[PDB]
């Protein structure tokens, strides 16, 4: 079929995606996740420290 | 009249490449924009509102040849 070559191109593209972009996007999301969670925990930690200092 | 339609078709053809400046002009505007904001950062929101206006005025006249090509195809 003619258009089957286009499906093969799409398969190769998504293979390259799952090989390169998927782990990079995973690492970016994990970095942002860790930053947000750490700041969210530090807010409550400083709140508890200021409550104990009172 | 199996001759004038071929001529108007090739006339839309020659009047298609008139957007050549639209391919070049707008770009060099952004060129200076990249040479403008990268030199002085804090003029971004001052040069960009007129940069998009220059783009609009550049694709305005860079498109009338293309609509001439449209209306000359039909």
């Amino acid at each position: 079929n003619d258009e089957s070559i286009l499906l093969l191109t799409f398969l190769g593209f998504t293979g390259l995606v799952a090989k390169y972009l998927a782990p990079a996007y995973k690492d970016f999301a994990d970095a942002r996740m860790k930053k947000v969670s750490d700041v969210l925990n530090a807010s409550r930690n400083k709140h508890v420290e200021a409550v104990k200092d009172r | 009249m199996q001759l004038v339609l071929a001529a108007k078709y090739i006339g839309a053809g020659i009047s298609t490449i008139g957007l050549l400046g639209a391919g070049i002009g707008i770009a060099i505007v952004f060129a200076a924009l990249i040479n403008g904001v990268s030199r002085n950062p804090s003029i971004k929101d001052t040069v960009f509102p007129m940069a998009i206006l220059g783009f609009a005025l550049s694709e305005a006249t860079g498109l009338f040849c293309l609509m001439v090509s449209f209306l000359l195809l039909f």
Partner: protein, 67 residues
């Protein structure tokens, strides 16, 4: 003399409750709305006026945008 004896044990109970009730990695905004209607009220006023820009957010929380 009793005011301090009450206010010290109040904060002591608060610290004893907060030490075992911090699910920060799994907290739900539904619980925050159930404890704080101020969240919903501020969201409602912010949408009605249109202050989609939330001040004091970009500094400690990065905008994370493409540009």
């Amino acid at each position: 003399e009793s005011l301090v004896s009450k206010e010290l044990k109040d904060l002591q109970s608060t610290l004893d409750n907060i030490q075992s009730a911090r699910p920060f990695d799994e907290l739900t905004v539904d619980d925050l709305t159930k404890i704080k209607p101020e969240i919903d009220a501020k969201v409602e006023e912010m949408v009605k006026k249109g202050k989609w820009d939330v001040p004091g957010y970009k500094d400690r929380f990065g905008n994370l945008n493409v540009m």
